[PDB]
Design a protein around this ligand. Structure first.
Ligand SMILES: Cc1c[nH]c2ncc(-c3c[nH]c4c3CNC4=O)cc12
Length: 274
């Protein structure tokens, strides 16, 4: 019942069921990421690729299926070393459509840095910040606004490569007012400059090794608190030039904040001093 030219257009994103083994009997992340399962993807050469398979239970009618094909076509053009890629999509005869993602061995970045077992250095933490900045620079270059950037929404692969996630077909893996720019709190509109604000908060989470921001301020009171000029304080083991970068991200004037290219330039120079 689907439109044939749309079916043709999505072909390059479609993973055939003979290319994929899904283990619907073993979930990833104890259900905390929703209906996400271990899977094995067979590439053109027959190489076995460990993947994360999400079942899209929200899709029922043919109209929802059609919009889903588009989201897949759009996100398949989005690939960068610091952005979570889309491996492909599955259109099943019986059962919900599937989203196929690369497996992220060390899960989300917030839980990784919060874990007592892991001891990342100040340099390693700065390195994660630089990787996120690189991923965001790529997104911003394609005029893509994330809207929910935070350490909880970045993943870490087996090589400790940070991937900006929670966007496109990788969203809803389960308002973020304490990560939101002052103008987003006032207007409910999001821009790349509001993403820069959220990046600033993410850098603070990195340097505090996952501490929650403004723990004594209600989500309702955040607007007034920011209007008074109060900002997150300098973390104990945060280099002064990197705290200046964080403060730049939270400038009340969106146009005054650094671009993601500026952030990459400035943070790489800080990383290189260590
Ligand atoms: C969103 C997403 C796409 N691919 C993923 N692969 C793995 C995980 C993940 C979340 N938590 C944990 C993992 C792996 N081990 C864990 O303890 C998430 C994703």
């Amino acid at each position: 019942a689907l439109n044939p030219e749309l079916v043709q257009a999505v072909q390059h994103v479609v993973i055939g069921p003979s290319s994929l083994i899904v283990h619907f009997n073993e979930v990833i992340g104890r259900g905390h990421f929703g209906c996400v399962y271990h899977g094995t993807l067979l590439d053109n050469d027959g190489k076995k690729i460990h993947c994360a398979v999400k079942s899209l239970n929200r899709i029922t009618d043919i109209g929802e299926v059609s919009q889903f094909l588009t989201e897949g076509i759009i996100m398949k053009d989005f690939s960068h070393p610091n952005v979570l890629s889309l491996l492909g999509i599955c259109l099943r005869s019986e059962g919900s459509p599937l989203v196929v993602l690369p497996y992220m061995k060390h899960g989300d970045l917030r839980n990784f840095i919060r874990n007592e077992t892991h001891n990342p250095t100040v340099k390693d933490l700065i390195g994660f910040g630089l990787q996120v900045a690189k991923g965001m620079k790529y997104l911003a270059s394609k005029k893509f606004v994330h809207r929910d950037l935070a350490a909880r929404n970045c993943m870490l692969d087996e090589k400790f490569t940070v991937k900006v996630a929670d966007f496109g077909l990788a969203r809803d893996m389960y308002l973020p007012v304490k990560w939101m720019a002052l103008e987003s709190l006032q207007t409910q509109k999001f821009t790349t400059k509001s993403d820069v604000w959220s990046f600033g908060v993410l850098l603070w989470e990195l340097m505090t090794r996952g501490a929650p921001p403004y723990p004594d301020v209600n989500t309702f009171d955040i607007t007034v608190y920011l209007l008074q000029g109060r900002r997150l304080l300098q973390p104990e083991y945060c280099p002064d030039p990197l705290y200046e970068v964080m403060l730049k991200c939270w400038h009340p004037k969106a146009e005054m904040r650094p671009s993601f290219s500026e952030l990459v330039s400035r943070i790489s120079a800080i990383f290189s001093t260590f």
